[PDB]
Amino acid sequence: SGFRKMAFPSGKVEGCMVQVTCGTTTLNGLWLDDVVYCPRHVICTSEDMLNPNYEDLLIRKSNHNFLVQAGNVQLRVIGHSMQNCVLKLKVDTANPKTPKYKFVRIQPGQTFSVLACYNGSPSGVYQCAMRPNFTIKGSFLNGSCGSVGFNIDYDCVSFCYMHHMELPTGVHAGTDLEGNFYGPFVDRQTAQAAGTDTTITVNVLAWLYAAVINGDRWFLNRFTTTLNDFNLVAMKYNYEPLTQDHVDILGPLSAQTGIAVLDMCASLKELLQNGMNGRTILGSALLEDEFTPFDVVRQCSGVT
């Protein structure tokens, strides 16, 4: 028992991290097969980042200007192309440590592990959620760009995120591995508004199920509710509206605990309206929304 914010083991991704230097800028790259993927802003200087013309900037760069270093060995760049906001550097060597992988674009509310890197070197791993407003609340300092987010299913690594920037609000923005930003963000040093963020309701309910499984049951009450009545309360507290699809995904947890989804919603409604009264749930004094129903099932059953 016990419930932790667990990240995936990062080994398969560590073997893909490289350092990419272009001019005076150095960030992280992802080496899969014979391609190195990195944020296209590696070609910008401090003057450029304010209003960069990436097409014009990339034209002044040749294969020999992209310095890709894997650990201590230098990779030979034989091709360069820009796909949306990522650069794809074709190298002459396939990464011998390339795991089985997919590029996937996650949905808001889904979770993933981030391997924070600097100079192509991994420093730490943590689990986070793609916020409903398409930002992530990570831990990224200068040089962390090109650090990636992923999920692991047995031997397959699904890369879902590449870090590009920190907004003036301190939240983080990035792209999928095809270089498409999550959200309305652009790779430009300009003030950018992240949408109104909401709490991922289905994840909070999944976490309440995880709490019941582990013994924290004080919040369970003698009440029930309807999807419509629950959503009136969810709207008032800036929670994502619960849909029947969310109820269906909570099915296995509802089955395991014997607590109907709408009964769990009534507990959540009471917690939203009354607060925690100084108590904690799974060692937390707030309602946790960065565990999906799949995370709860995996953790609560020991999926390796």
Ligand X SMILES: CS(=O)(=O)NCCN1CCCc2ccc(S(N)(=O)=O)cc21
Nearer to its own copies, 95 or 225 (CB): 95
Contacting residue, 79, 168, 195, 215, with ligand X by CB under 6 A: 168
22, 38, 44, 145: the catalytic one is 145
Q: Give the residues across from 73 on adjacent strands.
A: 70
- The one of ligand X, its own copies, none whose footprint includes residue 49, by CB under 5 to 8 A per kind, is ligand X
Site for its own copies contains 125 (CB under 8 A): yes
Site for its own copies contains 115 (CB under 8 A): yes
80 tagged catalytic: no
Site for ligand X contains 170 (CB under 6 A): no
Please, which residues have CB within 8 angstroms of residue 276's CB and are 6 or more apart in sequence? 285, 286
Gap between the Cα atoms of 42 and 187, Å rounded: 11
Site for ligand X contains 142 (CB under 6 A): yes
Gap between the Cα atoms of 266 and 263, Å rounded: 5
Site for ligand X contains 125 (CB under 6 A): no
Contact 265, 213 (CB under 8 A): no
Size of the site for ligand X (CB under 6 A): 10
Site for ligand X contains 189 (CB under 6 A): yes
145 tagged catalytic: yes
Strand order across the 86-91 sheet:
73-75, 66-70, 17-22, 25-32, 35-39, 86-91, 77-83
Q: Which stretch binds its own copies (CB under 8 A): 131-139, 192-200, 226-234, 259-267?
A: 131-139
- The one of its own copies, ligand X, none whose footprint includes residue 189, by CB under 5 to 8 A per kind, is ligand X
Q: How many CB atoms lie within 10 A of CB 122?
A: 17
Contact 107, 243 (CB under 8 A): no
Helix (H, G, I), strand (E, B) or coil at 88: strand
- Site residues for its own copies, 225-264, by CB under 8 A, read none
Contact 23, 43 (CB under 8 A): yes
Gap between the Cα atoms of 194 and 212, Å rounded: 34
Q: Which stretch binds ligand X (CB under 6 A): 117-125, 162-170, 176-184, 266-274?
A: 162-170
Contact 10, 67 (CB under 8 A): no
Q: Give the residues across from 235 on adjacent strands.
A: none
Site for its own copies contains 291 (CB under 8 A): no
Contacting residue, 214, 229, 262, 297, with its own copies by CB under 8 A: 214
Nearer to its own copies, 119 or 189 (CB): 119
Please, which residues have CB within 8 angstroms of residue 210's CB and are 6 or more apart in sequence? 3, 253, 282, 291, 296, 299, 300
Site for ligand X contains 49 (CB under 6 A): yes
Residues of this chain that bind its own copies (CB under 8 A): 1-11, 14-15, 115-119, 121-126, 128, 137-144, 166, 170-172, 214-215, 275-276, 278, 280, 283-286, 298-304
Which residues belong to the active site? 41, 145
